[PDB]
Design a protein around this ligand. Structure first.
Ligand SMILES: [Zn+2]
Length: 257
């Protein structure tokens, strides 16, 4: 089974998932100087006031906070998107040290972590069908840098002890994802893919320009999770990020100049 270790890491994925070498793989490095400001890009529309979180789960490679997506409760639209996208879950990628952890990079600069809010296009009926379409998913990428604590992230940090190992989950209701958004919604957008197998090229990436700050103590808590299941040898869950992939035939657009 794939992972992030020396023998089953990103460089090995192509053997079981040939699309790892495809034309629109993520993440990528965002070169702020060659990104084209596109005046036709609309402002993002994030509607999370009716969001219903259900639970948090350690899936062996990250932890996902899942939401009820049976109705248009938490949606994303506008920006470079056509149609409505429902939020299904959010997760993070982090490093063993503060100088690494993000998947996307800005001018080769790596951040301590990266938050991804995953949404699927309602036109397709369910998440499973959406991943098979070129415009099936819309993922919001938000960078985390170490500085002052992020109040809204604390409820997530405090629950991590109960989902230490792979397979564990915990009820996680009434969490408001609006507390994780930076103040500005300026962004870069490009056509890409899922960053973990099956690596399907069904994602319209929306990476926010402005990072959020989290405390050293907060990021430290992420590093206490385990890739392993209970009772097995302990492998700390750190560096669960895939390196930048070649841009190829793609243009990165910016909503700001
Ligand atoms: Zn991710």
């Amino acid at each position: 089974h794939w992972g992030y270790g020396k023998h089953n890491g990103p460089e090995h994925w192509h053997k079981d998932f040939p699309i790892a070498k495809g034309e629109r793989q993520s993440p990528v490095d965002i070169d702020t100087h060659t990104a084209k400001y596109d005046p036709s890009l609309k402002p993002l529309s994030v509607s999370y006031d009716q969001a219903t979180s259900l639970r948090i789960l350690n899936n062996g490679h990250a932890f996902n906070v899942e939401f009820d997506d049976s109705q248009d409760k938490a949606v994303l639209k506008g920006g470079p998107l056509d149609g409505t996208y429902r939020l299904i879950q959010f997760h993070f990628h982090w490093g063993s040290l503060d100088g690494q952890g993000s998947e996307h990079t800005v001018d080769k600069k790596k951040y301590a972590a990266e938050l991804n809010l995953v949404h699927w296009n309602t036109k397709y009926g369910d998440f499973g069908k959406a991943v098979q379409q070129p415009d099936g998913l819309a993922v919001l990428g938000i960078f985390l840098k170490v500085g002052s604590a992020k109040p809204g992230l604390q409820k997530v940090v405090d629950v991590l002890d109960s989902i230490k190992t792979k397979g564990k989950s915990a009820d996680f209701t009434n969490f408001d994802p609006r507390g994780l958004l930076p103040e500005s919604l300026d962004y870069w957008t490009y056509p890409g893919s899922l960053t973990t197998p099956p690596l399907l090229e069904c994602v319209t990436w929306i990476v926010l320009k402005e990072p959020i700050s989290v405390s050293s103590e907060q990021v430290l808590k992420f590093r206490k999770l385990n890739f392993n299941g209970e009772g097995e040898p302990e492998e700390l869950m750190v560096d669960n990020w895939r390196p930048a992939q070649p841009l190829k035939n793609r243009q990165i657009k910016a909503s700001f100049k």
